[PDB]
Every structure is written in C-alpha cells, then in structure tokens.
C-alpha cells in the first residue's frame, strides 16, 4: 500500500449507493490513489457496487472502522474478533486491501484507571484471530493510536507497536493520526521513529481538524521523519470540514473547523503533495 | 498580578496544612512570584493558615477551580453563582487575588450538541453575578478556555472573549492554556492576539502536559505573540508530572507525562524563564 | 502603501519596453496590488511608458535598488545623495509611490571591522538629504536591513529603527526581509516586534531564495507578529527562481534556487495569501 | 568518534599554553566528551602539552581548519596537499582522531562563477592525496559543507556527499552546520537524511552564531532526522560569544553574538543535552 489517500468522510458519512459513487468520483476527479472507505453500518454496504465504483475510476481503497461498544476487545474479545472478521469479508469483497482504525476499542472508550494487563491480554487475543483472518483473505491489519480523550489502551505509537510486537504477526501495521501525535508524542516525529518499519498508514490531519498547512502540527518535523524512516505507506487526509452540525457528539466537534470541504480539498490535499515532494516521499 | 506562577499540582492536589506547606516553600525555592492554589474542597481548607504561609514566604496567589457538576452554569446557574460566591470567599481570605480555571462549567461536560443560546445566556447571568461578588472582595475573575473534549462552552480564546464582552464586567479577564489553544486555535499565536483586551494569565503548559519546551506548542510564536500584544500578566506553569496513578481518572492521563516533578520544575521554569528573557516579556 | 507584491525579478530585472509590459502584466494576472520594480541602469527607463502600463493594469509600484560602489553612503554621501535623488526622479515620473532597499550601502560592503561612529554619521548626511527630495516627490523613503556578508551598517531591525529615529524623517520606513531575518533576528518575530513602530515593507523571501513555505523560515511566528503589532505596509515576494547564471556573482548564488519562476509564482502566491488570511493580516 | 563536545573557540583562538589549559580544563568541566581544536598557526601548537592536557582530563579530540588562501585547493591542490598533510601531522601528534572543516578551500572563496568540473577534479585528486596520509596516521578526514557566502564549492550536504562518493575513501566522513543549513537546505532536515551514509560530525551552532535554542534552527527537525538516520557521531557546539572584536572581520560579525560565553555554554550545552535525551539520540 503506497500513495495517496483522502477519507471518504471529505464526501459522504453514509456509504449508500449515491454517497459511495460520489466519494469514488471526488478522490479521482483530485487524483489520489487511495480512498479509504469508513464500515459504520456492515449491513448497508453493497460491496459489489463499491468494487465496480473503484474499477471504474481506477481506484483503490481501505476500509476504516471504530468498533462499536458492544464489540469492545478489552472486555468482550469474541464479540470484537467476530465484528472485525465480518468487517474484513465486506472489504475483501469490496476490493478493498487492508482494515484499520480504531480496530481494537471505542473512541469513546475509558475505564477511570490506567490500562490493565487482562484489558492488554483480551486485545492480543482479539486482534491475533482476526488478523489471522485477514491473512486468510490477503489483507493487511492496521491499529491506529488515538488520544487519551477516547481511548485508554493506545495512545503513543510505542504502545501501538509493543501491541504489534505481543501478536507477532507481519500482516498487522501501526497506522498513526498528526491529530493525535500532536497530544500524545514528545514531539510529533519521535511518533514516527517509535513506528519506523511498523508505520505503514497515516491520517494527515490538522491539530484543529482543519486544513493541512494551517495550525499547529509541525508538519517539517513529520515530513522529515517520515522521509529518513523511508516510509512507503499511505497518507490519507483527515479533517471534519464537511462533517454536519447533527455528527457534532460523535466526533465530540462544537463550531465549524474550516471554511467548507472545497477549500480543505484544494489547499489542503495540494499540501500534502508539495510536502512530500520537497521531502522526497516515495522517491 | 505580573509575573511568574507555578501551579500547586506540582507538589499536590489536596490542600491540607502539610500539602499547603510543601507547595508553597516549593513555590518559593523556585523563586516563583505566585503560587495557583486549586479549591477542591471548600470546607475542608483552612484560609487562615495559607494566608500566613504565603506573607511568610512572600509568596502571592490565584486560586483556580473546576465546577462540579451539580452547579454547571450552562444548565443550572443558581447552583454556580452560589458556589463560585463560596470559592471567591475563600480564595479572599487566603489573600489571592483572582479565581479562575474552568469557572462556567465542568472539564467533562458535553451535551452531545452544539452550545446553544439559552446555555450562554445562563453563562453569562450566572458570570456577571459572581464577577460582581468578587469585584467587592477586590478579587479577579478569569474565564479559561479548554479543548472540545473537556467542555462544548468556551474552547477558543475568541469564545472567551464575546462571552467577556457580553458580560461587560471591568474585573475579568481571559485565561489560555497552550495545552488548549495547541487543539483549539488556529494557529495557535491567533488565540493570544484575538484575546489582546483581555488576556491576563497564561497556563504555560506543554502538548503532552509533560515539561515545557519538550513538546509539540510552538513556544516562538507564543512568546512572540505575547510580547507584541504587550502582555502584563501571569506565566503559570501546569504539568501532570507530579500526578499519582491514583488521579488518572480525573486528569484523564493513563502514562506517565515526564520523569519527575523536580525534572519537570528545574527544567520547564528555566525554559519558560529564558524564552521570557528572550522575547523581553516583562521589560 | 497596503496590500501584496511582486518583485520584477520574478519575469526580469531587465526594464526596457518589452521586460516592463511582460512584468506588469504578469504581476497583474496573479491579482498583486503591486509590483516592485528595481531601477538598476537609470537612463534606460522609460517612465512614462511605465507609468501607462502600471495605470493601464491597475497596478500600483515601488521602485528599489542597491546603491554602486562609488556611490556608498557610509565612505562617499555626495555621490550617494545624486544617485538617490535621481533615482527618485525617475521613480516618481513613473508613478512609484516609493524607494527602498539598500539604500544606504552595497550589498558587497565590508570594511573588516565594525561600522564606526562616522559611517554613522555619512549615511544620516545623506539620506536626510534624499528623503527630503523624496518629500517633495511624495515618494516614501525605505531602509531594508540586511545580512552581515552583504553589509555591515544595517543587519539588524534594532540597527534600521535607530538609523531612522536619529534622521529624524517621517517620511522614513523599516523594510524588513525574511531571508536576511533568517539570520540576524534572535527569533525572527524580534525584528518585526522591534520595527512596529516603523515596519512599512517586507520581502517575503524563504531562507534558500526559493519557493514561501517550503524552507527554513517560520512563518507562524512571522505572521503572528505582523498581525499582532497591526502591521499595514506591503508584503512583497522575493525570490530568485527567474535568475539566469550570468546573475550568479551578482546574487552569490552558485546553484539554482527551485524549479522555475511558474512554480514559485503559482505556489509561493498563494502561500502568502493563505497565511495572511490566517492571520487576518489585511483585517 | 561518538559524543557531546565543544569548540575550543568557547575559550580561546590562540592555543598557547595557557590557552590549552584554559580550554581543555573547560571542556572538560562541562562533562564533554570531545573539545575541537582549531589549527590556524601551526608552529605554535606544542604537541606533547595538548595530548598530556587530552589524557589527563579524560578528553578526545578533533583538529579543524580551513585552507589558507595560498593553498585553496580548487585552483592550487598541490599546495592544499602540502597543507592538509602538515595539518595531519600535527593533529596525530596531538592524539585527535580526527581533521575536519573547511578542508577543501576557504571562507572568503569566490570565483564569481558557479563551480566548474575542473574545480571539482582540484578537490577530488587533493583530498583523495591528503585523506591517504590520514589513513596512515590512523585518522579520518572530514568536510565540512558552508554557506554560499563563504565558500562557492561546498554548500549543500547534496555536494558534499557527491564528493565523497567521486573521492571513494573509506575514511573521509561528511561533517553539518546548522547554521549553514538554515540557509543552504531547502527544509534543514533534509540535508542530514542526504548525507545519512556519511554524516559523522555535527556543528550544533544557532541561527546567529549566538545560544543553540534561542534563534531560528528548527532544532525539533534537526534532532528528528539525526535519530532517524541513527546518527552515531559527535554533536559539537559552536558559537561566536567569547570572541573579541578584534576578530570581526575574520568571521563577519560586526555586534555582539550573545551575552557571554558563560550563558552560551552554560544554557546552550544543556538545551543540546535534554534535545538529545527527547530524540534519544545515541540509545
Ligand atoms: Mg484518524
Ligand atoms: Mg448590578
Ligand atoms: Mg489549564
Ligand atoms: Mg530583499
Ligand atoms: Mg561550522
């Protein structure tokens, strides 16, 4: 997996018919390479119409997911493995080459107490079986570390890769969030040294939920680590800009966080291009 | 009030006798000009002794709170006047010459909507009130921004400032934390220029509330923006580092933020010190 | 004198009927407010034709240059008072609103020693003089610090703010450049805060004379301390991507700068368009 | 060669024995591991008393220089070899391990004209001749790339590399400066991913000249890149503050770098240190 990526969440919350061809178009009219496509609802995807879109447009996808409490791995690990192994059938059969996310908990997700070893032991049971299933249809595993307002269990991409480390298994990678970094890591590319090989995913987000290239992630420090670990992975912009004021407590978002969606589009996606290239990303 | 402070949670959050003496001759080895002493429980401290320990160490102070949830204004003002009234009595009789922190809600309170205008007309009622009750005291009142995950009211140094304008006291005063501003501003030297009237304290506090200078806040474009809008208040520092396991619930902190409290102190103050020489903050 | 420039240099430094056209209307297609046009051989401009194009195009102009070797001020002020007073005259016929840049010396100037009293004293003599000549004209007369290879009276905003202060001229201005404040601003912010009461101009330049927002230069801080002293003059891109190699001593440029004049108008445009709309720059 | 040191320039130019004393005895007292000594006068550097001094004080060593104009080996590389190799022999004579700088030409170095193929054939038959002779006394030889100011042959660690590659000596490493890199990398990060098979030796100097932490090197890069390469080699400082004005024009200085070399040593060694420990930057 090596290109660029935009979050279908840019176009469409939903991934109905109408909203799955108009995410597909968008990314190809701005030339990524990837879109990655968020499972919310696993029923509702028609994933031959979504496999049929993307070789239409010549693209390719990942699938994204946040697992929905009732499948949260530190508590109820044979309801997550069973919720991830149905995700990762609807992205194979998309088309799809990898599952990442929040893949092992909720991004509302606290006990009141630091991370315990038996929440620690569930989450490697979980995530093994499933990315063993994975392995099974070809895909690729990813876990992304989110801040400690969501979650409690991966926080840093240190836990993240001592997590990747316990399952063993070479098809699971570390996928890591600028939002994210920008409160976890003691300075944003020590996240990405931490990573190194393991880092094969990135969502290339602002620290307001912006737009790249206005605010406060210090983006040279992250293009400069990302370039000397030699990353060949995916950079996926993520920002909230065409989220509606109804999304506002699932993504805990309470004004509006840039101009419109055109804008972060234009300016923001032509930033990650011209960063890499003065960095040499992918040369 | 000008000058240098130091938050007590680097040597305690309760304020007993013993954890006042400790934090306040801490305070003073470090030759720091306040002191942030934090008002948990109202009926337990004791103002005349902290009264004392502060004229003996020549130590000034601001006090600083959390609204508990019973006494949120944005849905219960009566509740917040009457214990912002009781805090403001304290924080008079222990010689501090301001209250402020989150003092308009809770640092875990969201409604799961936007603010709506009936919440900010109870804001401001319930505000005006107790600016009022601590201008005859001949005390302060500071208004503290916090980020989207901890309050849905006054995240951005631009809410803080129409919620002081609407209120049109002469006694209160915007309040930032870089912590804060580096999620919620746009830039995060754009939260300390659109508070330019009103800005009066600082929490200088790094991105991973670990040790000032060894983060991801871009500490130039803070200093810079301070020292050009000709600032004239407190710098506070505000670090977990010296915060038990036993409090992650509260601070929502799940790892250690730094190696120790002394770590810490010695070399965030110094650090914060040298950046102040620098961008000539004081003269 | 308000809003964004463009250097001639960008199409030519050449100034003959063909260059100023193809410039000025250059500058008028990527929407500048003004263009600044460098006079370098005085009698081959023709200034009416100049001023044609410029009100033809909607566009407004300052002119600069760099003073010649027999003409430096700090040794030979009568000679620097004719060559400036005649560059004024031509300014002014074509319609310029100002003349700035090293007007007080070369930009190859060194003594091996530091500026001495009377140097001093030679260039207050001399541009007293002219800017009273510049009065008359009601052309604005600028003073642009520089780095200490190029010169050794003017590197620092401190050094241009007492220059114009001890001259006594109101019709006097600090031009400040970002790739000179590169190196001799202890934090590039300094020199903006310190010219606030002067600072009319700036060249926008990044540190390797390439392409804004793709080097060394922090903009941030650059940005946030423009907007938070109010500033009101010009912000003028510098670049030298449409050199040719026979500038090269000229410029003590020995590699290429980017890749081409297109891609630095295009992207280091908007750039400065973007980060001004940031910082609300022009309110 | 691995570790902290200083240049001896902290202390003196002139290396007597006094001078020795006084620098080795310093070096020493801030904990380094490495102090740089400079070769300017070389029948006045006594031998026997620098390498007792090194070993009674527990300090390694590495000589620098830069070619004297007589020999600049772009137009003269016999008398550069002549140069290089009495150099070698009093740097082995003192137990340095090492002769790195501006060994390739000077600091005051212009054609005019961009570098020529035979310049190059100059460097390459010369510092090939004299990296030979450091072979047999057991030392490597180092380059040290510079401004465009001061040298028109080596500013990017781009060229740097190349010429180490043309030379294809097992013992010639590629030596940075930050404050040359603020000017000559388009993003100062990149030149040390350019030279990560090569780079060895590290001027650590600010932006100014003045306190490494309090100027405009983006020193979160800097450090990210070094750990990310994996640097292992030798982190120098240098800085201009305890030279006198007597040396202006040999440097270019014409105002006061910082305020001592006792706050440069003493604020900028220990920003170096904690910087190193946040990027862990030799395990
Ligand atoms: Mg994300
Ligand atoms: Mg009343
Ligand atoms: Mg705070
Ligand atoms: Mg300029
Ligand atoms: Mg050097």
């Given at each position: 997996m090596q290109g660029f990526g935009v979050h279908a969440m840019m176009w469409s919350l939903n991934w109905d018919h109408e909203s799955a061809r108009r995410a597909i178009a968008g990314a190809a009219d701005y030339g990524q390479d990837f879109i990655e496509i968020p499972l919310?609802?696993?029923?509702?995807?028609?994933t031959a119409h979504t496999r049929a879109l993307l070789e239409k447009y010549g693209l390719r996808a990942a699938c994204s997911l946040v697992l929905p409490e009732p499948a949260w791995?530190?508590?109820?690990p044979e309801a997550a493995v069973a919720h991830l192994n149905a995700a990762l059938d609807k992205a194979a059969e998309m088309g799809a080459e990898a599952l990442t996310g929040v893949?092992?908990?909720?991004?509302?997700?606290?006990?009141?107490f630091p991370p315990t070893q038996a929440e620690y032991d569930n989450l490697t049971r979980a995530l093994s079986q499933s990315a063993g299933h994975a392995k099974t249809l070809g895909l690729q595993f990813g876990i992304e570390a989110v801040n400690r307002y969501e979650n409690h269990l991966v926080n840093s991409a240190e836990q993240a890769v001592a997590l990747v480390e316990r399952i063993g298994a070479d098809n699971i990678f570390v996928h890591l969030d600028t939002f994210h970094m920008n409160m976890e890591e003691k300075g944003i590319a020590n996240g990405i040294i931490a990573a190194h090989?393991?880092?094969?995913?990135?969502?290339?987000?602002e620290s307001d939920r912006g737009?790249?290239?206005?605010?406060?992630?210090?983006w040279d420090a992250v293009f400069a680590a990302l370039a000397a670990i030699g990353f060949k992975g995916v950079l996926t912009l993520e920002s909230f800009a065409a989220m509606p004021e109804e999304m506002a407590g699932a993504i805990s978002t309470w004004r509006p966080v840039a101009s419109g969606a055109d804008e972060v589009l234009d300016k923001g996606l032509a930033f990650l291009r011209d960063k890499a290239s003065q960095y040499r990303i992918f040369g």
């Amino acid at each position: 997996m090596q290109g660029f990526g935009v979050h279908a969440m840019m176009w469409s919350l939903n991934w109905d018919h109408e909203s799955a061809r108009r995410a597909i178009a968008g990314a190809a009219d701005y030339g990524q390479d990837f879109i990655e496509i968020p499972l919310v609802d696993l029923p509702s995807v028609d994933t031959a119409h979504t496999r049929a879109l993307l070789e239409k447009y010549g693209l390719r996808a990942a699938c994204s997911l946040v697992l929905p409490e009732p499948a949260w791995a530190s508590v109820r690990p044979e309801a997550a493995v069973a919720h991830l192994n149905a995700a990762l059938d609807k992205a194979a059969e998309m088309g799809a080459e990898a599952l990442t996310g929040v893949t092992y908990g909720g991004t509302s997700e606290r006990t009141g107490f630091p991370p315990t070893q038996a929440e620690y032991d569930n989450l490697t049971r979980a995530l093994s079986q499933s990315a063993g299933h994975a392995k099974t249809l070809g895909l690729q595993f990813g876990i992304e570390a989110v801040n400690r307002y969501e979650n409690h269990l991966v926080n840093s991409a240190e836990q993240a890769v001592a997590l990747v480390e316990r399952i063993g298994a070479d098809n699971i990678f570390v996928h890591l969030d600028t939002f994210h970094m920008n409160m976890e890591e003691k300075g944003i590319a020590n996240g990405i040294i931490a990573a190194h090989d393991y880092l094969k995913y990135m969502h290339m987000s602002e620290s307001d939920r912006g737009t790249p290239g206005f605010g406060n992630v210090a983006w040279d420090a992250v293009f400069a680590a990302l370039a000397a670990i030699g990353f060949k992975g995916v950079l996926t912009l993520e920002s909230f800009a065409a989220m509606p004021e109804e999304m506002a407590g699932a993504i805990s978002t309470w004004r509006p966080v840039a101009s419109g969606a055109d804008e972060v589009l234009d300016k923001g996606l032509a930033f990650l291009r011209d960063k890499a290239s003065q960095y040499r990303i992918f040369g």
